[PDB]
Design an enzyme around this catalytic site. Sequence first.
Site, PDB file in Angstrom:
ATOM      1  N   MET B  80     -47.682 -13.861  -9.580  1.00 31.94           N
ATOM      2  CA  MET B  80     -46.422 -14.405 -10.083  1.00 31.94           C
ATOM      3  C   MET B  80     -45.228 -13.595  -9.591  1.00 31.94           C
ATOM      4  O   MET B  80     -44.202 -14.162  -9.199  1.00 31.94           O
ATOM      5  CB  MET B  80     -46.442 -14.450 -11.608  1.00 31.94           C
ATOM      6  CG  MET B  80     -45.159 -14.984 -12.236  1.00 31.94           C
ATOM      7  SD  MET B  80     -45.341 -15.221 -14.008  1.00 31.94           S
ATOM      8  CE  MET B  80     -46.281 -16.741 -14.022  1.00 31.94           C
ATOM      9  N   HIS B 102     -56.311 -13.504 -16.058  1.00 28.67           N
ATOM     10  CA  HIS B 102     -54.882 -13.793 -16.160  1.00 28.67           C
ATOM     11  C   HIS B 102     -54.379 -13.907 -14.723  1.00 28.67           C
ATOM     12  O   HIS B 102     -53.948 -12.925 -14.107  1.00 28.67           O
ATOM     13  CB  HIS B 102     -54.114 -12.735 -16.968  1.00 28.67           C
ATOM     14  CG  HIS B 102     -54.591 -12.583 -18.378  1.00 28.67           C
ATOM     15  ND1 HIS B 102     -54.373 -13.545 -19.341  1.00 28.67           N
ATOM     16  CD2 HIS B 102     -55.266 -11.582 -18.993  1.00 28.67           C
ATOM     17  CE1 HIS B 102     -54.895 -13.146 -20.487  1.00 28.67           C
ATOM     18  NE2 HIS B 102     -55.450 -11.962 -20.301  1.00 28.67           N
ATOM     19  N   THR B 103     -54.538 -15.110 -14.166  1.00 29.47           N
ATOM     20  CA  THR B 103     -54.494 -15.310 -12.724  1.00 29.47           C
ATOM     21  C   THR B 103     -53.114 -15.027 -12.150  1.00 29.47           C
ATOM     22  O   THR B 103     -53.004 -14.712 -10.960  1.00 29.47           O
ATOM     23  CB  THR B 103     -54.930 -16.733 -12.372  1.00 29.47           C
ATOM     24  OG1 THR B 103     -53.960 -17.671 -12.853  1.00 29.47           O
ATOM     25  CG2 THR B 103     -56.295 -17.040 -12.984  1.00 29.47           C
ATOM     26  N   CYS B 104     -52.061 -15.127 -12.965  1.00 28.92           N
ATOM     27  CA  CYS B 104     -50.718 -14.854 -12.470  1.00 28.92           C
ATOM     28  C   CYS B 104     -50.533 -13.379 -12.158  1.00 28.92           C
ATOM     29  O   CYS B 104     -49.649 -13.027 -11.371  1.00 28.92           O
ATOM     30  CB  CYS B 104     -49.685 -15.303 -13.501  1.00 28.92           C
ATOM     31  SG  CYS B 104     -49.595 -14.246 -14.966  1.00 28.92           S
ATOM     32  N   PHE B 105     -51.343 -12.520 -12.764  1.00 28.85           N
ATOM     33  CA  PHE B 105     -51.449 -11.121 -12.389  1.00 28.85           C
ATOM     34  C   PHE B 105     -52.685 -10.869 -11.542  1.00 28.85           C
ATOM     35  O   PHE B 105     -52.940  -9.723 -11.160  1.00 28.85           O
ATOM     36  CB  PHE B 105     -51.494 -10.227 -13.634  1.00 28.85           C
ATOM     37  CG  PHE B 105     -50.345 -10.431 -14.575  1.00 28.85           C
ATOM     38  CD1 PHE B 105     -49.044 -10.235 -14.149  1.00 28.85           C
ATOM     39  CD2 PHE B 105     -50.566 -10.817 -15.887  1.00 28.85           C
ATOM     40  CE1 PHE B 105     -47.983 -10.422 -15.012  1.00 28.85           C
ATOM     41  CE2 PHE B 105     -49.508 -11.007 -16.754  1.00 28.85           C
ATOM     42  CZ  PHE B 105     -48.216 -10.807 -16.316  1.00 28.85           C
TER      43      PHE B 105
END
Lengths: 446, 127
Positions: B80, B102-105
Amino acid sequence: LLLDHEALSCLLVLLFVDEPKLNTSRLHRVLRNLCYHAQTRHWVIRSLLSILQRSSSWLSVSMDAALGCRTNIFQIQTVHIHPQAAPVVCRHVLDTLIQLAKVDFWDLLVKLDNMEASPLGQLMNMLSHPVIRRSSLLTEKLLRLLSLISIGLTENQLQLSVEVLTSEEGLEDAANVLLQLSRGDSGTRDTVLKLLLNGARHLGYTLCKQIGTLLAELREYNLEELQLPSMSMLTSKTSTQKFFLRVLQVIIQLRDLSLDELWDMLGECLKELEESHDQHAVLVLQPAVEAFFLVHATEQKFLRFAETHRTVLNQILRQSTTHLADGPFAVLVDYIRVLDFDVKRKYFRQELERLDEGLRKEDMAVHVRRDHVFEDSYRELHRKSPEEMKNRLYIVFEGEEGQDAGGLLREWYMIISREMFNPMYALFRTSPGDRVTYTINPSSHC
Amino acid sequence: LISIFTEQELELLISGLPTIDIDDLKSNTEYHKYQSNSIQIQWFWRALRSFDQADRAKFLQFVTGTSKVPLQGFAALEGMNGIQKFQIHRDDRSTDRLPSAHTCFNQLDLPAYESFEKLRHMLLLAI
C-alpha cells in the site's frame, strides 16, 4: 429336402480338415442357406454339437498338431477325434455356429469311410470341457455365441467361472449373456446375482489375503523403488482386482457384499503406501479403490475415504486416463476440494469439450486496425453468437505482412488485455490498496 | 464448469501458474519476530520448497493478495505504501490458529508451530 444327410455329411467333413486356402466363409454361407430348411438346420446343428462333444481310407486326414506328431483327426475303431486336432475342429465348428446363431452324422460318416434356444443348455455345458475351458480363443468364441443366442444353476455357475477365472471382449460377451439371461426370468436373475455375489466374496477374501501380505511386507520394508513380490499378483493383468471389479460392474449393471475387513485394510494399506514415500506404488490398488467407489457411492463413507486419501486418489486420477467425468470417480464432481488444481483443469477442458462436442468449429477472421483493435473487435463480435466466438479466431491487421498466426494471436490477446486497462474505455481501475490489481471502474458510466 | 476452480485457481487458470524465484523472495523477505535462522523459518523454506508450483502461487496470493510475480523481481514487490517486501511476523497468539495475512503490508502473522510437519499442514490448509 434340397440335400440329403450324406451330402451334408460330406460338406461337414470340411470343418475337420484345416486348410488355410479353403473358403470357410463361403462354406458357412452354404450351410446357412441350406439351414433355412428347418429339418436340415436341425440335423446340421445336432451334428455340429455332436462334433463338439466328440472333440471333448477317405477319412485319412493328417493334421500337424505338435512337434514330431502328425495326428489323424479321425480314429475309427465309435469314431473319435484325436485330442491334438480337437481344438481346431472346435474352432471351425464354433465359427460356423456363430453364423447359424446369427441366422447320426457319425454313422453316415462311417458309411462313407467304408466305401436356437434349447441347445443353449448344451453350449453352456460345453464350458466345463477341457479343450474349451483351456483355450481362451474357443472360450471367447463360445461366449460370443452364447451372447448372440441369448437374444440351469450349474450352467450359470459355469458361465460365471468364466469371470471369476480367466479376454476382455469375451468376458464382455459373458456380461451380455448374464444380463440377457436376467432379462429372461426373475429366478435366473436372482440365482445368477447371488452366485456372482458368492464368487465376489471369495475374490474379496483372497484379495484381502494378498493385500495383507503386501501390507505386512511394506511394514518389513520400512522398519529397517517398490518391487515387493507380493505386488506381482496385483500388477498381473489377470489379478483378482480385475476379476473383482469386473464382477462388481456386472452386478451393478444387473441392479438395474459385506467386506469391511477388505475395505478397512485396503485403507490402512493405502495409508502405509503413502507414508512409505512412493507414489505410483499406490496404483497397484487402483482397481480395488474403483471397486470400493463402485459398491459405495451408488448412482458419506466414500467421502471420508476420499478425504483421508485425498492426495492419493488425486495421484490415482492424475495417472488414470479414465476420463474424470466418465469414469467411476465422477460422483465427487460436486465435492471439489477433493481434487488437484490441474486435475480440475483437465476435467474442465474435457467436460467443456463434452458439452461442446456437437459444435463443428471453423476458422474465422477478425479484421482490426493496430490502433483500434479493441473497438474493431467489439464491433465485429459483440453481436456475434457464443458459437461464433467458439470458432478459432485469426486476426488480420490492415496491410501488415503475413506472419505466424500463433505468435500473432498471442500478440492480439496481449494488446487486448492491455487495452482493457486504458482508462479511456473506463473498464478497470487499480485497487488503491494493492495498486497493481484491477477491478471494475465505478466511473464506467461515462 | 468454471465453479470447480477456487477463487485462487481461477486466477491460476486465467493468468497461469507463476514461476517463483524463491531465491528472489528469500532475498526480499523481511523477518520481524522470527529470524532468518529461526527453526520455524527453516521449516517455512523447506515447506515452501516442497510445495508444488500451485501451492507456491497460492502462498504468493495469500501474502501479497495476488499470484502476479513482479517483473523486476520481489525487490520491486509493492504494498500500500510503496515497495513493501514480503514479511514474516511471529504471531504471538495461540498456535492452534492459522497464520493470518494483511496483504497491503504483505504481512504474515505466523504462529510458532511446534514442528515442521504441523507448520506445513497448517500453511497448506490455509492456502
